């Protein structure tokens, strides 16, 4: 998991957020993200 040191919200944070993993959940229960489509 990548991390940017700087942050407008402050201290330090990993870049990925709740919305991305929500989209992953949606694509899994679709039954258009992939692992590669998160990599790009």
């Amino acid at each position: 998991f990548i991390v940017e040191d700087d942050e407008s919200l402050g201290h330090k944070e990993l870049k990925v957020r709740k919305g991305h993993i929500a989209k992953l959940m949606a694509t899994e229960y679709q039954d258009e993200y992939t692992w590669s489509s998160l990599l790009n």
């Binding site: 929500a22 959940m25 949606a26 229960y29």
Partner: peptide, 20 residues
């Protein structure tokens, strides 16, 4: 505390169905 001994998934799916 709740301490999370067990978890749920499709309920949170439906929560995001209402969130989106």
């Amino acid at each position: 505390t709740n301490a999370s001994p067990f978890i749920k998934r499709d309920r949170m799916r439906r929560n995001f169905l209402r969130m989106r």
